[PDB]
Amino acid sequence: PEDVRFMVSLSEYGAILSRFFEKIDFHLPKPYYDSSIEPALAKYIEEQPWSEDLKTRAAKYAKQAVGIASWYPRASFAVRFNCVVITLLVIIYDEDYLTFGDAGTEFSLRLVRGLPQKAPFLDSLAQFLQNTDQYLGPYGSSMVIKTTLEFVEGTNVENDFSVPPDALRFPRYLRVKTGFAETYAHAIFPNDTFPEHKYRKLYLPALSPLCDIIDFTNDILSFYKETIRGTERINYICNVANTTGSSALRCLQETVDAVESRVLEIHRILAPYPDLLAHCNDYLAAYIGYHIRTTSRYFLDEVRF
Amino acid sequence: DVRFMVSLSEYGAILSRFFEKIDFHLPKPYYDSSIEPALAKYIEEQPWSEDLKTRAAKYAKQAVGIASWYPRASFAVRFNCVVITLLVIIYDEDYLTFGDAGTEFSLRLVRGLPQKAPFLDSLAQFLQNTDQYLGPYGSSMVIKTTLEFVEGTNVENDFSEAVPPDALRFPRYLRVKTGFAETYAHAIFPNDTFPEHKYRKLYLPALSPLCDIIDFTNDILSFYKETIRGTERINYICNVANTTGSSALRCLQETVDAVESRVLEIHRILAPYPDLLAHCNDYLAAYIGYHIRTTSRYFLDEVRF
Amino acid sequence: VRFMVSLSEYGAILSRFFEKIDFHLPKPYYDSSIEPALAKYIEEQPWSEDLKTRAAKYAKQAVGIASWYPRASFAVRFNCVVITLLVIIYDEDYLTFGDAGTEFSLRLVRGLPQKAPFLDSLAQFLQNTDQYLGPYGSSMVIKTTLEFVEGTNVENDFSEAVPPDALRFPRYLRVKTGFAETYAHAIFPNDTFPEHKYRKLYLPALSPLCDIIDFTNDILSFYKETIRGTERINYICNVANTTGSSALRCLQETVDAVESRVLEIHRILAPYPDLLAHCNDYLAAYIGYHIRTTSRYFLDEVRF
Amino acid sequence: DVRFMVSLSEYGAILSRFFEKIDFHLPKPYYDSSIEPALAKYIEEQPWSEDLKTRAAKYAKQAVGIASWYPRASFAVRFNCVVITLLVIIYDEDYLTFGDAGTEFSLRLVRGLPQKAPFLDSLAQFLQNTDQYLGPYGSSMVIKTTLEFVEGTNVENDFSEAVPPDALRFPRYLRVKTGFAETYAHAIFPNDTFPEHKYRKLYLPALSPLCDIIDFTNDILSFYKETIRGTERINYICNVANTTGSSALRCLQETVDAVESRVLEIHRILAPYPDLLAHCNDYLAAYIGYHIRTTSRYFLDEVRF
Ligand SMILES: [Mg+2]
Ligand SMILES: [Mg+2]
Ligand SMILES: [Mg+2]
Ligand SMILES: [Mg+2]
Ligand SMILES: [Mg+2]
Ligand SMILES: [Mg+2]
Ligand SMILES: [Mg+2]
Ligand SMILES: [Mg+2]
């Protein structure tokens, strides 16, 4: 009885997704395969000064990280592989931040102090941030760093709201902090293809709508695995329903409309720049297709859309 | 063009209505005799050039007023807020004079390397010691906000006549990057009075509306010195006017309305927690009062309200 | 004699009562977590092993209180079950603690150890109600517990001693013994209904709700107290002894009073559908609990 | 609004009729030269701010008259009732000045913790020492009544506009919570004269009507300073007029009639016990007299009766 507000019937959820895909003209990409990413990530893991136990667990985490390469089908190996590596490291964080007790709780200070971290995988995370200039310009590097700091600490703080009714702006704030979207958005515009000194002023207006698309599209497409089929009640859609007193269904529909509006805004902003726009369109189709095709995480074969 | 061009009389009347709506009353003057001597000692201790020290003595006259924003806080909180204010005033005022040093800040910071200019070393050392007055989430947020501020300052004028007409989300995105709001908002809730492990879950829902209040209230109160009296056409209100094809006058009113809504939201969220609410109210009264009293920066003694 | 009520008279009163308030027995409520959590609670108290052994019996009665708050969190349901176990132990065995109860309130505010370990557990519960209530609710649970401990200690002083002209005294004593505010404040738990926003909405319903809680137990426990048992200092008998009326008349008047309060609560909380829903769930399960808990109220011996 | 209007002529006539119907005669003036010095010494001994001690000099002059309510009682009874009156006057007139301190009084009291304000430590100490003049039942009732008074005061501002017209029993509920009556009623029957083991079963049947007399008689006698001379519209009389669709004049008269009825009830219940009844008669005459004589609080020398 108390859970009705957060449930959505399967037929209605499938209809939400069908309307969403119609409205943004989503067309599923052909199946992505990159026989290069998995061996390279295995070699990365082997090279880390990690315990045998962490390397063993990282094999499972790597299976899910490698799908991120499919989001940037045209990008250089450097872009795809680095996006995959940072995804592996934040999956490990999401798994171990409580086990490591207070480790990530000191990540940012130890990072800016140049001090060894309390766990080797956090040293690997520090080194990644130290070498983002391998694939991003300096603005992109800065934002990957600041986004990682937000993610580490927001993940810590998330575990405290297992949400005040009057806090209308809080659900989006929490989702910004833990969604990691800015890191992926910057790889839509890699520094080798779009050097910042010439292109940053052209694509910067699209970064905020892209970050919304990345967060919100995952909220729409992972609501089944999080809340319908799962036990998750403190995600963005449930938080919005709690602070507005609305149903999960109505919040999902508002979020669908928000994504469509961001897509339209990006299509308008980047109309003069066909290559920048093509990178955005390619990302979005690959991103949605990744959610549909990865059934071990999102279970979308169980929904009719 | 007519889009801009807000009259002195129109602007004063809008400010009058704003102060009436939020029931603003100018606080009695705030004075702590320990702040300026401490800040003079800080400046004298920095390995800065003599001209930067003289100029910093000028900027200090503006920075010391920040202590009044936190009247119930410890000296360490008030003084550190004053110091970081001095540093970001220097960065903004003189970021032509540092050359490319700012563009290297984030990577040198996370590599544990010295900065290209000693002024930026002072900034890095501040970030390394934010745990002296904030908890772990607040310290991370000051670090990440400073990275955004340095990079947003660097890119701000790239958009001089280059704001795309339909880029609706961009003005807010740029203002988040340049406004530095999270740094001040977190010191509203110092870790000694409100330790994070007990209070963070209580005040965190208030941080996002507080950041909107900080950003937007400066936009309202500094529109005179930026756009009516000055030549700035790349600030938040002008960016909203150019992205919406609307007048600066109407966008200024829209920003007043947004701040008024945020003040109501904070008052609702923090109602159960009188201490947190009092720190917030003290902050808001003194932040507005600082804009009125610092005539050398905002020239509001020239407007009738 | 003036207190004789036959089985048939009593069952007919209950039948008409249930019809008039449109009572329907809820479907059985079960949370597999409640009974083991209460067993672990008992195991961790530093009570005598004899009291722990005894307390298993009272636990079987206490666990049903979770069904009064079916939409509430485990913290609300479980803490209501714990305080129920403690007050049942007090309600049945207060004489086994000697004069310990008489010093409970002063030892509590002084920070002194209680005269019996069981009362230390009661004090610890009162110190932790912020786990599930706001500040107003926490204060009410404390003040209600002080009243309950003292009303229980003095109740039986009035056997064959209730003075005829004291028409307000039966209600005064029932407020003290009924423990109602503790349960009423849990109907509106602080996580679902943060006090600062909702207390102005539900506080106007507290007075009739406490009347419903006290009086509905008086109606439904009259069989075990006075027909099947020997209790003659309960609310119904006290009213009969101050008014010179039969127990049957006073029982009927109490039923009529409850029906009126039910209409009142429905009027007060009608603009607030979630508050109203928690209230209705509470009342249906409160009555149902009296019917199903045959080991305490024996209502399977009555035809209604 | 005409519904709450009572003229000075009407109010004086109501008081004259009330006094003649209960056979009230202003008691011959009461004086114990020990009480005022003892309260000055109590104030001087508290670890309060000099400002609070200065304000408490004003409140003490209203508190010392409480000793006249118990003219046949020991100094322990009279002085303790004066002290707790001082403390609840400080709480009420000035819980603007204490903030959230009162909101955590009850939990800090039962946890054995220091209170957030020294004044509230004095209140907690009083509650711990009521066995100096009451038996165990009376001590419990003073504690529970103080908790009700503190919380009812803390929430009184929720209905500052009006109470819900639909909640007929709520005006009495509110008045019980904030009237503090049980604390004063139990001192009518002090434990040194009427040991609870023998006397409680004799006077407890009178406590409910006595609490009504205390609450309602103040409502009658403070109506002038609250609603005719002042601007209060959320006291018991006005709340009853709001919930019953009647006028404040009719509700004032009905409250007078209720008090007269309770007085007769008390005389009947305690008729067999002349010393118990005498303590009640002394109390009521001095309670009414206190309202007449404490012109700095009730202004009844501005009324003709
Ligand atoms: Mg998700
Ligand atoms: Mg997740
Ligand atoms: Mg500026
Ligand atoms: Mg500005
Ligand atoms: Mg019983
Ligand atoms: Mg009973
Ligand atoms: Mg008053
Ligand atoms: Mg009064």
- Dist. CA D245 → ligand 8 center (Å): 22
Report in angstroms the alpha-carbon separations of B84 from B267, B297, C87, D71.
28, 18, 58, 67
B2 lies within 8 A of chain A by CB: no
Alpha-carbon span D283 to D262, nearest angstrom: 14
Q: What DSSP designation does B235 have?
A: S
Nearest to D71 by CA among D33, D32, D37: D32
Alpha-carbon span B59 to B49, nearest angstrom: 15
Return the residue of C nearest to D131 by Cα: C106
* Fold held by C7-301: Farnesyl Diphosphate Synthase (1.10.600)
Give the other-Cβ count within 10 Å of B176's Cβ.
20
C139/D106 Cβ within 8 A: yes
Give the other-Cβ count within 10 Å of A113's Cβ.
16
Burial class of D231 by CB neighbour count within 10 A (0 to 12, 13 to 18, 19+): exposed
Cα B262–chain centre separation? 17
Q: What DSSP designation does C33 have?
A: T
Element (H, E) at C143: helix C135-154
Judge contact between D15 and D8, C-beta under 8 A: no
Report in angstroms the alpha-carbon separations of D232 from C237, D173, D222, D223.
42, 18, 11, 9
Q: How many helices and strands (H and E) does chain A possess?
A: 14, 0
Question: In the numeric block, which tokens belong to residue D6?
Answer: 């009572």
Judge contact between B119 and B48, C-beta under 8 A: yes
Resolution (A): 1.7
Return the residue of C nearest to A165 by Cα: C194
Alpha-carbon span D250 to D257, nearest angstrom: 11
Question: In the numeric block, which tokens belong to residue A120?
Answer: 């080797």
The CATH superfamily assigned to A4-302 is Farnesyl Diphosphate Synthase (1.10.600.10)
DSSP string, D72-124: TS-HHHHHHHHHHHHHHHHHHHTSSTTGGGGGGHHHHHHHTPPPSSHHHHHHH
Alpha-carbon span A51 to A54, nearest angstrom: 5
Alpha-carbon span C148 to B13, nearest angstrom: 62
Cα D260–chain centre separation? 18
Judge contact between C296 and C304, C-beta under 8 A: no
Write down the residue that tokens 């030269």 correspond to: D33
Smallest CA–CA distance, residue A88 to chain B, in Å, is 20
- Dist. CA A69 → ligand 1 center (Å): 18
Question: In the numeric block, which tokens belong to residue A240?
Answer: 């919005």
CATH of domain B8-302: 1.10.600.10
C268/D166 Cβ within 8 A: yes
- Dist. CA D278 → ligand 7 center (Å): 28
Element (H, E) at C35: helix C34-44
D200/C172 Cβ within 8 A: no
Judge contact between B227 and B4, C-beta under 8 A: yes
Question: In the numeric block, which tokens belong to residue A210?
Answer: 């892209």
D198 lies within 8 A of chain C by CB: no
B274 lies within 8 A of chain C by CB: no
Angle at which helix D118-128 crosses helix D75-93, to 10 degrees, equals 150
Q: Where are the domains of chain A?
A: 4-302
Residues of B in contact with A153 (CB under 8 A): 136-137, 140-141
Identify from C138, C196, C198, C200 which residue to disrupt to test chain B contact, counting B C-beta atoms within 10 A and taking the largest count.
C196
- Dist. CA A261 → ligand 2 center (Å): 25
Angle at A295 between CA A4 and CA A11, to 5 degrees: 35
Nearest to B140 by CA among A113, A128, A182, A119: A113
Q: What DSSP designation does C141 have?
A: H
- Diameter of chain C by CA atoms? 52
Write down the residue that tokens 């849990």 correspond to: C186
A200 lies within 8 A of chain B by CB: yes
Dihedral angle at the C-alpha atoms of C262, C265, C267, C272, nearest 10 degrees? -140
Alpha-carbon span D280 to D71, nearest angstrom: 11
Length of chain A: 305
In chain D, which residues are last before a break of more than 2.5 Å from C to the next N? none
Residue D301, CA atoms < 13 Å, CB-side half-sphere: 6
Alpha-carbon span A5 to C220, nearest angstrom: 36
B166/A153 Cβ within 8 A: no
Nearest to C278 by CA among C207, C214, C198, C189: C189
Q: What DSSP designation does A227 have?
A: I
Alpha-carbon span C283 to B87, nearest angstrom: 63
Alpha-carbon span A80 to A32, nearest angstrom: 13
Q: Which amino acid is at A280?
A: C
C27: left (phi > 0), else alpha (psi -120 to 50), else beta?
A: beta
Judge contact between B216 and A175, C-beta under 8 A: no
Smallest CA–CA distance, residue D267 to chain C, in Å, is 10
Alpha-carbon span C205 to C209, nearest angstrom: 6
- Dist. CA D153 → ligand 7 center (Å): 10
Element (H, E) at B232: none
- Dist. CA C289 → ligand 4 center (Å): 64
Smallest CA–CA distance, residue A24 to chain B, in Å, is 18
Question: In the numeric block, which tokens belong to residue D259?
Answer: 């008090």
Q: In A203-234, which positions are buried (b, 16+ CB within 10 angstroms) versus exposed (e)?
A: bbbbbbbbbbbbbbbbbbbbbbbbbbeeeebb
Alpha-carbon span D249 to D5, nearest angstrom: 7
Cα A73–chain centre separation? 17
CATH of domain D2-302: 1.10.600.10
Chains A and D lie in contact, requiring 3 or more CB pairs less than 8 Å apart: no
Give the other-Cβ count within 10 Å of D264's Cβ.
13
Give the other-Cβ count within 10 Å of D214's Cβ.
24
Residues in contact with C233: Cβ distance below 8 Å, sequence separation at least 6, in sequence order = C155, C156, C158, C159, C162
Give the other-Cβ count within 10 Å of D244's Cβ.
14
Collapsed DSSP state (helix, strand, coil) of residue A77? helix
Residue A1, CA atoms < 13 Å, CB-side half-sphere: 10
- Diameter of chain B by CA atoms? 53
Nearest to A73 by CA among A279, A302, A217: A279
Give the closest ligand to the alpha carbon of residue C61.
Answer: 5
Judge contact between A60 and A279, C-beta under 8 A: no
Return the residue of A nearest to B163 by Cα: A205
Structural biology method used: X-ray
Judge contact between B136 and A106, C-beta under 8 A: yes
Burial class of A165 by CB neighbour count within 10 A (0 to 12, 13 to 18, 19+): middle
Alpha-carbon span B290 to B30, nearest angstrom: 10
D144/C147 Cβ within 8 A: yes
B140/A108 Cβ within 8 A: yes
Angle at D270 between CA D266 and CA D271, to 5 degrees: 105
Report in angstroms the alpha-carbon separations of A155 from A98, A177, B137.
10, 8, 10
Write down the residue that tokens 């009739």 correspond to: C208
Judge contact between C215 and C257, C-beta under 8 A: yes
Alpha-carbon span B40 to B79, nearest angstrom: 11
Residues of B in contact with A108 (CB under 8 A): 136, 139-140, 143-144
Helix residue ranges per DSSP H, D156-246: 170-179, 181-187, 196-223, 236-244
D112: left (phi > 0), else alpha (psi -120 to 50), else beta?
A: left
Give the other-Cβ count within 10 Å of D39's Cβ.
23
Question: In the numeric block, which tokens belong to residue C15?
Answer: 């039948």
Collapsed DSSP state (helix, strand, coil) of residue B234? coil
Residue D218, CA atoms < 13 Å, CB-side half-sphere: 19
Alpha-carbon span C69 to D296, nearest angstrom: 50
Neighbours of chain D (3+ CB pairs under 8 A): B, C
Q: What DSSP designation does C158 have?
A: G
Helix residue ranges per DSSP H, chain B: 8-21, 35-45, 50-63, 75-93, 105-110, 118-128, 136-155, 170-179, 181-187, 196-223, 236-244, 248-269, 274-293, 295-298
D26 lies within 8 A of chain C by CB: no
D162 lies within 8 A of chain C by CB: no
Write down the residue that tokens 């020294």 correspond to: D118
Question: In the numeric block, which tokens belong to residue C68?
Answer: 């009064």
